[PDB]
Design a protein around this ligand. Structure first.
Ligand SMILES: COc1nncc2c(C)n(C)c(C)c12
Ligand SMILES: COc1nncc2c(C)n(C)c(C)c12
Length: 330
């Protein structure tokens, strides 16, 4: 089997991407944030505290003839941005782009933090990291990909995120029309539960490439590119007036600037992030200070190849017996 679904930016900044997912019988379609940095499929639901729902579409398990309470199971998650959610668990039929898993754990939120309530466009998350990170207790549950894997034509999924435009998540096949040149594959460590790999270096604009190992994660659920402070300082030094602002929470730059590109290494290959991808617009409405898309990972504890980086590539998440990541230009 295979599946193919379109993923769409939630806003004009590409803060996140949503992908429609069918849950239950008859289908209930929710728009979920596919997140290769976590491993829970959780949704706003008929059980979510009413004052914490503000425009999201909810899953109602009592209206699904295939939903079953997973007795005694609970879940609770906290994300790198300080947001959180928790609740109980059902199993139900879940389909993505024509690919169906029966008995998928669907984690129903009883509580969500304010940042989830405030984002009316995201109805929940669909985790695509390794199932060892799944938070369900006392019986840990498998991701949608993990459950689908054995049925797929090939044990892979691909992320093809758009810049200010729709893109695609495919399961079970590699669309050879979706990228240019060849796909360069690189080793993955699953020891922390992430799609963790080592970039071979970087360049800023038309500058020379610096060969240096940068260990980080491929995370579709993180908006920005978070890299070591040395690398980030070298980038922003090329932008007149750019500075790190503790009051704003990162590097800012004049909105009048034209940003340089940023290149990252994948083995001997190179992925070029155009400068425009690094512009996140005014820090507040009407401001002439703009927020940067490359930020320091210092004080996160891990480097994160988030959407800013991933959207410049066609990315293969290879879940073969020894997982690997592939990157191609597009
Ligand atoms: C204008 O965009 C922003 N402004 N201020 C802080 C931000 C943070 C922390 N992130 C991730 C974005 C996209 C920001
Ligand atoms: O301020 C912000 N702080 N954190 C994330 C943000 C995302 N966008 C678009 C803005 C303006 C943000």
């Amino acid at each position: 089997s295979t599946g193919s679904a379109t993923t769409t930016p939630i806003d004009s900044l590409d803060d996140a991407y949503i992908t429609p997912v069918q849950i239950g019988t008859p289908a209930q379609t929710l728009n979920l944030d596919f997140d290769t940095g976590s491993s829970d499929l959780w949704v706003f639901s008929s059980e979510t505290t009413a004052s914490e729902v503000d425009g999201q579409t909810i899953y109602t398990p009592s209206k699904s003839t295939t939903a079953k309470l997973l007795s005694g199971a609970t879940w609770s998650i906290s994300y790198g941005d300080g947001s959180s959610s928790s609740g109980d668990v059902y199993t139900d039929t879940v389909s993505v782009g024509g690919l169906t898993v029966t008995g998928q754990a669907v984690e129903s939120a009883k509580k969500v933090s304010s940042s989830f309530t405030e984002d009316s466009t995201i109805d929940g998350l669909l985790g695509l990291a390794f199932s060892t990170l799944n938070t369900v207790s006392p019986t840990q549950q498998k991701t949608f990909f993990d459950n689908a894997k054995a049925s797929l034509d090939s044990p892979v999924f691909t992320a093809d995120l758009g810049y200010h435009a729709p893109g695609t998540y495919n399961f079970g096949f590699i669309d050879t029309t979706a990228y240019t040149g060849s796909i360069t594959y690189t080793a993955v460590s699953t020891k922390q539960g992430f799609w963790e790999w080592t970039s071979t270096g970087y360049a800023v604009g038309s500058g020379t490439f610096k060969s240096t190992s940068i260990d980080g994660i491929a995370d579709t659920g993180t908006t920005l590119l978070y890299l070591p402070a040395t690398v980030v300082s070298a980038y922003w030094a090329q932008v007149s007036g750019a500075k790190s602002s503790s009051s704003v929470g990162g590097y800012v730059f004049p909105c009048s600037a034209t940003l340089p590109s940023f290149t990252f290494g994948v083995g001997s290959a190179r992925i070029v992030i155009p400068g425009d991808y690094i512009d996140f617009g005014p820090i507040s409405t009407g401001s002439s200070s703009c927020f940067g898309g490359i930020q320091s990972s210092a004080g996160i504890g891990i480097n994160i190849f988030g959407d800013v980086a991933l959207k410049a590539a066609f990315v293969v998440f290879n879940g073969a017996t020894t997982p690997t990541l592939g990157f191609a230009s597009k």
